[PDB]
């Protein structure tokens, strides 16, 4: 790992914490640098092939450099990559996305999930004329002030004015009693309730039907808009995302990751009535030099076509199931308390706890055990998130030999850590 | 324009205002759709070649599909386009950028100018422990709450809480007296003063030396960080940007557009002391799935190399000068009040006013005349921003025949509008 070591030294003084995104710094023993990626694999700068169970944290459900997407991007590149004026790809991608998540509605393309949720929140506030936003402990919506808050709302980040943080309410995920209580107290001032249909940033945590039911009922009865943050679930839990998977409906649907095919993206979709408030039609401001970036649009379009024509969902589901069954077989024999949460192709293991239905329980999981597992798996050529609070993602290339390596790696790594 | 007309009809119900960014909707008679771009030209979906004096509003100083950048991106695409782990290109681009704008400092790559200024503001607040941010009337820093404010600070966008807007102070650009007064009253609570060294979103407005002097003095004496928003000026006003061009120094330098070579990008650069507050090193949060996107990094790196090895600055400067001289020759003969502001390769014409040193004066310019000019120029195959408040940008391909067409087009269009 000499080459990665050298790069590690160079970035120490170039980037805060040596990385451009926090999670990247936690890789053990130290972050490896990537030369390239193809299919189910990442290849380090030193030349090592690694099975990728991170998939850039969600966007790469088709694996690395998917042939169909590569070809579409090559064609798009030949046409120039930025215009500052409308292109064709954005129209086709919008029509395809809306047909699955909000028929007859509108969409606005942005450049990150952070920009997307931020825009959704401004839209909900503009539509209702209210200021408060309700989020849940453990849910992650990006790097912007309004969502960098925790229940005393107080800042979880330095540099966030307390005056801003106090406009965001926070209650526990899957806690119906707490949800009812917050609406009883502040309901008429809540502009929107934002939530991940399946938590992906506090490990993976599935929603309780009762929580989903309350979210829809309380939002509708209070006048608050239900903002489903589907940046991760969108197009991962089937073509119709969380709405179709759980049979729920959101007022505003925030999308990202997968819809950009691996390129910078974010999007806000909703009814014509709500979406029409966005500039230049309405007074809720949103603009972006890179909005509807030609390459992002071409990549996302090709990606969704693959999701419609290739067995991505079945393959990804089976891959996650195989990993879950393998880990469960080993862990069940130990008699140690543990739980694995899986929803289709997103999952995570929690050692030390028998149930994880909220962030508080996820935080009680054995972090040391997880870190050791991450390191041992990497030593065996399999890459899983370095943080127990991140998720494990599967995709199209996780089949055949690649899957065999991942499963065998997981089995052996668990045994090694359990034997230490 | 049948094909653009058809697309126009399709997007009416897909996007708010029919576009993904406000300015795009103002093109006359209606927005044309782009098939591709190459060199100094955009090509409509109907097949018409148009000289581009918009350059995607700043990023394309090298023109469309620059050969060197295209090759670098092709090589990068073959390596996969998203890893979720550190790559080599981000290291090289960071080293090159910092060598020109903040030697010995640090940088953090994000996905838009909006994310960049938003991150800079959070950093300034975190570093100083203060809440107030001072901006100037007419300056544009992106699509986020803290900068969508105007002096009563009150919201300029619906959906922005008044509690948030009041944390942002606003005074006129180039107004030293007003600047001194605001610091005398609120100085000890100002975390940072953000400003465009050259305004590019209220037409083009150059800074007064006295204003630049006051900005540096007052920030230093008050403890507020001077945030130079160089999203547009960075790498356009020479390799050293505004700091080198005007011989000024900022505490935090916000970069974007050009540094991404045409791909989604944004960046915050500053001293190690300030930048070290960013996660995972410090407590000022910033994370991004697409931060340091492999393709953006490769494109930006190749772009900066071109700026160092090709006569981009001289060619672009001469192009803008030729346009300015041509327009001035025609307008001087009319005796009508007007002014053209130009700083290297960024400029704008203001009809009806003899001086434009601030946003208030820019707003007094004859908008109807400008719109007619935009439409007439487009009819003659030359594309300038549809809004008088946007800027005209020149670049490397604006030479030879392309420049002749632009200049002749400007001359003829002015005469036609002046004769109507
Ligand atoms: C649900 C959710 N929302 C928002 C984001 C942030 O997306 P981005 O990093 O592109 O700003 C993420 C990524 N962790 C996410 O998982
Ligand atoms: C000075 C400045 N700052 C910020 C921005 C916004 O950049 P972006 O559109 O990528 O969010 C712009 C683009 N108009 C700008 O000119």
From Swiss-Prot, chains A, B:
Alphabetical list of PROSITE patterns matching this protein: AA_TRANSFER_CLASS_3
Xref: NCBIfam families: hemL, PRK00062.1
Pathway noted in the entry: Porphyrin-containing compound metabolism; protoporphyrin-IX biosynthesis; 5-aminolevulinate from L-glutamyl-tRNA(Glu): step 2/2
Keyword Cytoplasm: yes
HAMAP family cross-referenced by the UniProt entry: HemL_aminotrans_3 (MF_00375)
An annotated GO BP: protoporphyrinogen IX biosynthetic process
Organism: Aeropyrum pernix (strain ATCC 700893 / DSM 11879 / JCM 9820 / NBRC 100138 / K1)
Enzyme Commission code: 5.4.3.8
Gene coding for it: hemL
Protein's name in the database: Glutamate-1-semialdehyde 2,1-aminomutase
């Amino acid at each position: 790992g000499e080459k990665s070591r050298m790069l590690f030294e160079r970035t120490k003084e170039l980037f805060p914490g040596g990385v451009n995104s926090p999670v990247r710094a936690a890789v053990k023993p130290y972050p490896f640098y990537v030369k390239r990626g193809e299919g189910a694999y990442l290849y380090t700068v030193d030349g090592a092939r690694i099975v990728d169970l991170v998939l850039a944290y969600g966007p790469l459900i088709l694996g690395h450099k998917h042939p169909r997407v590569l070809e579409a991007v090559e064609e798009a590149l030949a046409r120039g990559w930025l215009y500052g004026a409308p292109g064709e790809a954005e129209v086709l991608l919008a029509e395809k996305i809306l047909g699955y998540v909000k028929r007859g509605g509108m969409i606005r393309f942005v450049n990150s999930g952070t920009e997307a949720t931020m825009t959704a929140i401004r839209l909900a506030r503009g539509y209702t004329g209210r200021d408060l936003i309700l989020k849940f402990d453990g849910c992650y919506h990006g790097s912007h002030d309004a969502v960098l808050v925790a229940a005393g709302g107080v800042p979880t980040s330095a540099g966030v004015p307390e005056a801003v943080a106090r406009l965001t309410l926070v209650t526990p995920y899957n806690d119906v009693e707490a949800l009812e209580r917050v609406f009883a107290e502040y309901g008429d001032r809540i502009a929107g309730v934002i939530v991940e249909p399946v938590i992906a940033n506090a490990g993976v945590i599935p929603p309780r039907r009762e929580f989903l039911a309350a979210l829809q009922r309380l939002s509708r009865e209070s006048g608050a808009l239900l903002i489903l943050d589907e940046v991760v679930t969108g197009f991962r839990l089937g073509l119709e995302g969380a709405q179709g998977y759980f049979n729920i409906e959101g007022d505003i649907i925030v999308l990202g990751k997968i819809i950009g095919g691996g390129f910078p993206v974010g999007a806000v979709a909703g009814s014509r009535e709500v979406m029409s408030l966005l500039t230049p039609q309405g007074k809720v401001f949103n603009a972006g030099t890179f909005n509807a970036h030609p390459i992002t649009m071409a990549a996302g379009l090709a990606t969704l076509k693959a999701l419609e024509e290739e067995p991505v969902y079945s393959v990804s589901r089976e891959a996650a199931k195989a990993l879950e069954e393998a880990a469960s077989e080993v862990l069940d024999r130990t008699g140690l308390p543990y739980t694995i949460n899986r929803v289709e192709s997103m999952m995570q293991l929690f050692i030390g706890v028998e149930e994880v239905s909220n962030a508080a329980q996820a935080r009680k999981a054995d972090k040391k055990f997880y870190v050791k597992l991450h390191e041992e798996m990497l030593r065996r050529g399999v890459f899983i998130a370095p943080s127990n609070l991140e998720a494990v993602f599967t995709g199209l290339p996780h089949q055949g030999e690649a899957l065999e390596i991942a499963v065998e790696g997981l089995r052996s790594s668990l045994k090694t850590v359990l034997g230490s």
